[PDB]
Design a protein around this ligand. Sequence first.
Ligand SMILES: [Cl-]
Lengths: 160, 38
Amino acid sequence: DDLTIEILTDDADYDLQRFDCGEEALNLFLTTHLVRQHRNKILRAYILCRNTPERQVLGYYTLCGSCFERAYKNIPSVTLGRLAIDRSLQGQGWGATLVAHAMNVVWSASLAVGIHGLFVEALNEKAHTFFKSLGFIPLVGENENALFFPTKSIELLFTQ
Amino acid sequence: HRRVILNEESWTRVMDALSNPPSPGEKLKRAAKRLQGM
Ligand SMILES: [Cl-]
């Protein structure tokens, strides 16, 4: 395959204007906010691209360190806040491959500093179903848009 | 985009996920195998 998954490169140029995932909010985030938020350290942005000098982006995901707390304890974690796949690639399982990439990054970081899980943001029922099919535990009430996956399950994915 | 996750009974679901971690399903295993050789 011609496609690769890599973290956004600090001094590289990307072809993003053409990107279309079907959600207007995720498109505008990529073409006006993603690059500056990554470079300004607000998040860590990972790109699915064509591995050409032109760097045509056909999907992306964003990560940021977080902590989960109850209305007692604390959970050092990582949040996957955005996931978008271009319409041209949809149906080939690229969304799931990007989550597996994310999980491997989060796993490596747990092995280094100690992170107990991965939280994900699902703004709609189609994404919630997608994250549930990948094994994420759905949270309820105020946390209805969040799903959780522990580091121990990620370790199981890349060791068995 | 959440750096402060504030839980309630969602807290027990996360606690239970930590003590009883889910087994990776076939869909996720496929994604992991696709990622392996890329
Ligand atoms: Cl997918």
